[PDB]
Amino acid sequence: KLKLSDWFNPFKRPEVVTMTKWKAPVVWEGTYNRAVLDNYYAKQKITVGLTVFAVGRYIEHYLEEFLTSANKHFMVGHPVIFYIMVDDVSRMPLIELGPLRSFKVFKIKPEKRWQDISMMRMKTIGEHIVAHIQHEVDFLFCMDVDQVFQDKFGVETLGESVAQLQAWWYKADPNDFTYERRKESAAYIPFGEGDFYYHAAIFGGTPTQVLNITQECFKGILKDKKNDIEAQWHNESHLNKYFLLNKPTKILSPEYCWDYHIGLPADIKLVKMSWQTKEYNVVRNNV
Amino acid sequence: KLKLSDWFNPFKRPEVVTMTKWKAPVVWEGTYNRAVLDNYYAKQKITVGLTVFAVGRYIEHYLEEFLTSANKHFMVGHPVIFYIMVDDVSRMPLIELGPLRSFKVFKIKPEKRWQDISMMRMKTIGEHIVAHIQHEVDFLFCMDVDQVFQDKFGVETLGESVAQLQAWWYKADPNDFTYERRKESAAYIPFGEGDFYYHAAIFGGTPTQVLNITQECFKGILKDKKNDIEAQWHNESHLNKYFLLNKPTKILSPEYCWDYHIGLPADIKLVKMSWQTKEYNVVRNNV
Numbered sequence A, B: 001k002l003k004l005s006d007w008f009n010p011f012k013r014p015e016v017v018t019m020t021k022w023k024a025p026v027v028w029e030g031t032y033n034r035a036v037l038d039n040y041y042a043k044q045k046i047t048v049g050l051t052v053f054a055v056g057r058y059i060e061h062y063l064e065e066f067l068t069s070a071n072k073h074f075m076v077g078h079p080v081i082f083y084i085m086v087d088d089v090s091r092m093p094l095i096e097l098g099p100l101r102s103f104k105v106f107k108i109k110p111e112k113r114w115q116d117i118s119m120m121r122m123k124t125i126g127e128h129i130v131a132h133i134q135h136e137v138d139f140l141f142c143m144d145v146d147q148v149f150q151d152k153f154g155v156e157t158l159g160e161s162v163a164q165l166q167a168w169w170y171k172a173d174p175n176d177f178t179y180e181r182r183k184e185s186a187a188y189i190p191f192g193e194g195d196f197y198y199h200a201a202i203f204g205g206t207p208t209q210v211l212n213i214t215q216e217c218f219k220g221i222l223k224d225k226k227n228d229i230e231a232q233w234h235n236e237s238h239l240n241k242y243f244l245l246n247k248p249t250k251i252l253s254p255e256y257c258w259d260y261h262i263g264l265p266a267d268i269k270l271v272k273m274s275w276q277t278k279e280y281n282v283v284r285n286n287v
């Protein structure tokens, strides 16, 4: 049986938060023993899934860069399936995949508002988990397309439910977090509450956990609609409320999703994934 | 450990050849216990590969029908990877895949002669086995594109080296077989020799065996080129020579690759795959 101490050493990064009050690890560069985990998971013969949505001009701007870097860096040494959700398969970029990568593509309906395109992902991911993903993989990650893998993103990131620290807020106090603060929203988090500010651009877990994450978020999204309210940061608002009520068993450091517009401070030792520069004028078709 | 008698009962089909003189089974409808094999192989967590080439007009004519039918019928209930080799990846038709199916596509060089397009597959298959396929699957089939799955083609077909009985010749006397009969060819088989006439449209096995099948065949092809000779039926002449020397551990009946131009006689109880009708005038550009 795998124990935390087998692979995780918090003392290697004493200058950062490495453990939660519910005893979940926060995975920083230097703290993980990947060789130990690679072996353990190889014996279990795991497969890892990754979902990514590209609707509209997100395809031309981000899909190729995301997939090319994911092929190179994501869960290397283990079978991986990329689940690619696009509104137009004819614009799908043509890329060669390396050993232990395969893919499958689904044509989805494009929603009118980008806000709904972004939020409907929660419904769609859940449907695919029930239909097929639960039968195909042991762990799943669900990611935004507007980012690029920069270095190895491996088995150290795997857990039951996995959350990402948003790069701009990891050192901030909870009362400074851009949580949804309107009590009328299902995503509401009161001042005086909250552990961390999680980024919606990366989350994961077992198919069971990810289905619950996505079902609960989508229920909140739908309730808000009935109450004529839309959460400030959409999925992220709902995701943060979810991870407040149901604590993640693993958190990833901002090294796993870093914004270079911040610069590069001392705490960030080796970037695994970086944000693409925002291009809303082009890639979005409404305010 | 799996035994032949666990899943194979020759006495269900007494009117046809069910065993070879080297004690390999000839798999006919009614002889196999798929439920037993499905459970055995699921406990082993096997993955099955399938290679398919479509170069030139073979893409528009055959590829979509091949893949749609393969998704539906090939190794159902087990993870499958379709390996798709095309000269024009933009012409590759995209279909939705069901549970436990995924794929990956490779752009290949189109050879000038259709004879070399066909024969080069041996070299190309071998390269992919070494590069990735050996790490990805437990068993591999290699198939022509100009055919379509008609019913379940499952784990009853798996084995170390697997050969297909050519539908027109299965009852024929070996000295009527269209073996290469010129002693100058590497594919030469004399009169007085031969067990069966195997079809080049389907062959399989473990990546180790398939590599040896394809390397040996390609060496014969290249030797012939140095001697200014081309084997009468190309890959198939060489494949027949190979299986004479290195006997298949499993043979599939003509039910697994049936030509409806023959009609449907009593022996063919359930067709798993049918030949597409020959359209050489349109799909081939030389000789």
Ligand SMILES: CC(=O)N[C@@H]1[C@@H](O)[C@H](O[C@@H]2O[C@H](CO)[C@H](O)[C@H](O)[C@H]2O)[C@@H](CO)O[C@H]1O
Pocket (backbone or CB within 6 Å): A166, A168, A178, A199, A200, A233, A236, A278
């Ligand atoms: C300190 C500060 O305000 N920094 C902001 C970033 O928060 C902002 O990133 C956006 O953050 C929201 C949640 O607040 C959400 O995660 C968005 O996806 C993300 O883009 C950034 C945008 O460029 O600007 C900084 O000034």
Ligand SMILES: CC(=O)N[C@@H]1[C@@H](O)[C@H](O[C@@H]2O[C@H](CO)[C@H](O)[C@H](O)[C@H]2O)[C@@H](CO)O[C@H]1O
Pocket (backbone or CB within 6 Å): B166, B168, B178, B199, B200, B233, B236, B278
């Ligand atoms: C008995 C007889 O002559 N049958 C032929 C078939 O052999 C022939 O099929 C072709 O056979 C060659 C090997 O001889 C090779 O396998 C080809 O791939 C295959 O198409 C068929 C052609 O339609 O005609 C029959 O008459």
Ligand SMILES: O=c1ccn([C@@H]2O[C@H](COP(=O)(O)OP(=O)(O)O)[C@@H](O)[C@H]2O)c(=O)[nH]1
Pocket (backbone or CB within 6 Å): A052, A053, A054, A055, A056, A058, A114, A115, A117, A118, A143, A144, A145, A146, A201, A278, A283, A284
């Ligand atoms: O019109 C859209 C809007 C969003 N998305 C998907 O939803 C994700 C989240 O949207 P976005 O990245 O724009 O939100 P942000 O991170 O910028 O806040 C994107 O990465 C895309 O995968 C999309 O495909 N088309």
Ligand SMILES: O=c1ccn([C@@H]2O[C@H](COP(=O)(O)OP(=O)(O)O)[C@@H](O)[C@H]2O)c(=O)[nH]1
Pocket (backbone or CB within 6 Å): B052, B053, B054, B055, B056, B058, B114, B115, B117, B118, B143, B144, B145, B146, B201, B283, B284
């Ligand atoms: O011009 C060609 C010739 C052949 N092939 C591939 O090679 C296989 C063997 O050729 P073919 O089926 O025409 O041989 P046959 O079975 O008719 O004798 C085909 O099924 C294709 O997969 C191809 O893609 N383009």
Ligand SMILES: [Mn+2]
Pocket (backbone or CB within 6 Å): A144, A145, A146, A201
């Ligand atoms: Mn994003």
Ligand SMILES: [Mn+2]
Pocket (backbone or CB within 6 Å): B144, B145, B146, B201
């Ligand atoms: Mn053929």
